[PDB]
Amino acid sequence: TNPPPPETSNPQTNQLQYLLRVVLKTLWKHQFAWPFQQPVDAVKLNLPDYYKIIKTPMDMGTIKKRLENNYYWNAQECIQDFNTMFTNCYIYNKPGDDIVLMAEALEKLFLQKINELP
């Protein structure tokens, strides 16, 4: 069985609104977005070692749930989750894999969207 997804509720800056409404939304509609739209389903994908290697898992779906529930206090905490998501992919998969190239293309576009923020 897969581990439970990361918590998405803690209990509104302009940069957080921008990350959700502009950065995340554009990356969510990118063609290479599908493997990162929800937590890695290690059971269905038959990856019994994923959650042994990746100890801080993260996906765009959990970012959205966190951005919609005001989980983050600031934009830096949210930007770290994206970097957690990208670096997780680089750690588990092998260089040259198509998913690694997809993650690189997503990150390089992510740095452009955050390169112009309030």
Ligand X SMILES: COc1ccc(OC)c(/C=C/C(=O)c2cc(OC)c(OC)cc2CCNC(C)=O)c1
Q: Which residues bind Cl ion (CB under 5 A)?
A: 70
Q: What angle do the packed helices 75-92 and 98-113 form, to 10 degrees?
A: 160
Q: What is the rounded distance in angstroms from the CA atom of residue 34 to the CA atom of residue 10?
A: 27
Cβ atoms 67, 16 nearer than 8 A: yes
Minimum CB separation of residue 102 from ligand X in Å reads 8
Closer residue to ligand X (CB): 50 or 72:
50
82 phi/psi in degrees, rounded to 5: -60, -45
Instruction: Give the one entry of Cl ion, ligand X, none that residue 7 binds, where binding means its C-beta sits below a cut-off of 5 to 8 angstroms depending on kind.
Output: none
Interface contacts to ligand X, rule CB under 6 A: 34-35, 40, 45, 89, 92-93, 97-99
Instruction: Give the one entry of Cl ion, ligand X, none that residue 91 binds, where binding means its C-beta sits below a cut-off of 5 to 8 angstroms depending on kind.
Output: none
